[PDB]
Symmetry: C2
Subunit: 130 residues, 2 copies
């Protein structure tokens, strides 16, 4: 929440059009737009050692992602750090939920990296070949 | 409020990812589909909007790179006109008469309009 809010602040400062917020569990926590690129972010707070995300919730925000056509990311706030990975990194567990090892998240990207990444996607949009 | 809910339901039945809710400067509706962004400021009823709110939601549109529209509920019809269609007033504000809105697009024309934007998405 405070983490989402803080993330919002940073995205706005970097020029993004950003918004937050019944069907709550299946709507990305953060929806950030900039120059025609859509980035969806689900933020979770975990304070220990594998990160698990519930099946129905994961498939739901995923369907919202496919509809919107936006790039969906998982943002995790560990005790001493904040990370983001592509939601596609979550593998479905035997039981049916989705998870990613905390190792991967730690090596994930920071806000500034998320941003650089988003910027390169904007450039992609404006690029032409030949 | 209900008009919003209506529009929202409608775009949802058409495959759009939709969300509602300065505060005045945010479009009432954000609808997303296949990488296309459509923002809609809802006005239920001559439409008039104060300089700063208009430039305000305009900046959001511009930052977003999205397509900003005015969703208007007239006594007996629902129309959609590009926000760009608002003309500046001598007082420095922005307005549009309902005649222009009337010839605007129906909910269904807006969807096809988006499909066209999506097609074009495939050439870049």
């Amino acid at each position: 929440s405070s983490v989402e809010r803080y993330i919002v602040s940073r995205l706005r400062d970097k020029g993004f059009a950003v918004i937050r917020a019944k069907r709550k569990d299946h709507v990305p926590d953060i929806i950030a737009l900039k120059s025609g690129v859509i980035i969806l972010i689900e933020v979770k707070s975990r304070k220990n050692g594998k990160i698990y995300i519930e099946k129905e919730q994961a498939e739901g925000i995923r369907e919202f992602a496919k509809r919107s056509g936006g790039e969906l990311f998982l943002g995790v706030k560990l005790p001493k750090m904040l990370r983001f990975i592509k939601f596609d990194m979550l593998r479905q567990t035997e039981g049916g939920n989705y998870a990613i090892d905390l190792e991967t998240v730690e090596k994930g990207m920071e806000l500034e990296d998320l941003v650089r990444y988003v910027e390169s996607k904007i450039s992609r949009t404006l690029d032409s070949f030949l």
